[PDB]
């Protein structure tokens, strides 16, 4: 139960150390965009990030204390939300653009290359705009990302000791909550402002969930149309949502 005995500062340190690297896309500027190639680039990248994400998850305090089957469920539920919040964060400093990778920066018109995608882009762009308005800090972002991992899936658990097991997840979520407040208190926010920013931050997660739900149906539509061949991990990740 080491995760429940961390100070806020140690919690923050642990999450910062855990952060995965920023990967490059296989984008070739000498290749003219098509629906297939764009979806090819995005899925290839996402497929490479999933591996790093799995390794990041193991470093989130509390996560390794769960059973393997719990760990699988949380990740199956959250993976696209986690990709999206990382994207939105990377993009905060590039208005009107999404920084999928440092060599792959797309605007909304380039999203129109893929059927149904531009509406997802617009929401992702809107979320980064909100992050920029709020002046979201890196220490707040790594708390939010971990909250997404632990929260998405915590209530859809199929079930024993399930109850007792979930109790541990809620204790960690509470620790992350304390850590956020700690951060905000340290930055000089009054009590009132602390509760207000905490709520604003957590209310963004609702939108991130909605975007993930929409993105998931879009990905599934791409698979069905055979637009791009999807990797076996990404397929498994997608199929876990049991769409149509």
């Amino acid at each position: 139960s080491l995760a429940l005995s961390l100070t806020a500062d140690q919690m923050v340190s642990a999450l910062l150390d855990a952060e995965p690297p920023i990967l490059y896309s296989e984008y070739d500027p000498t290749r003219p965009f098509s629906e297939a190639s764009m979806m090819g680039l995005l899925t290839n990248l996402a497929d490479r990030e999933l591996v790093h994400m799995i390794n990041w998850a193991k470093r989130v305090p509390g996560f390794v204390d769960l059973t393997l089957h719990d760990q699988v469920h949380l990740l199956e539920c959250a993976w696209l939300e986690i990709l999206m919040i990382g994207l939105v964060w990377r993009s905060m400093e590039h208005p009107g653009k999404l920084l999928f990778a440092p060599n792959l920066l797309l605007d909304r018109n380039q999203g129109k290359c893929v059927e149904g995608m531009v509406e997802i882009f617009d929401m992702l762009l809107a979320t980064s705009s909100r992050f920029r308005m709020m002046n979201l800090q890196g220490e707040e972002f790594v708390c939010l990302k971990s909250i997404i991992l632990l929260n998405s899936g915590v209530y859809t658990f199929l079930s024993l000791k399930s109850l007792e097991e979930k109790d541990h997840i809620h204790r960690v979520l509470d620790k992350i909550t304390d850590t956020l407040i700690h951060l905000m208190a340290k930055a000089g926010l009054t009590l009132q402002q602390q509760h207000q920013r905490l709520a604003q931050l957590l209310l963004i997660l609702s939108h991130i969930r909605h975007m993930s739900n929409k993105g998931m149906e879009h990905l599934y539509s791409m698979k069905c149309k055979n637009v791009v061949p999807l990797s076996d991990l990404l397929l498994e990740m997608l199929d876990a949502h049991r769409l149509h």
Partner: peptide
Amino acid sequence: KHKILHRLLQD
């Protein structure tokens, strides 16, 4: 023990 994700979580 058959899912790819399960395998990668085990390493």
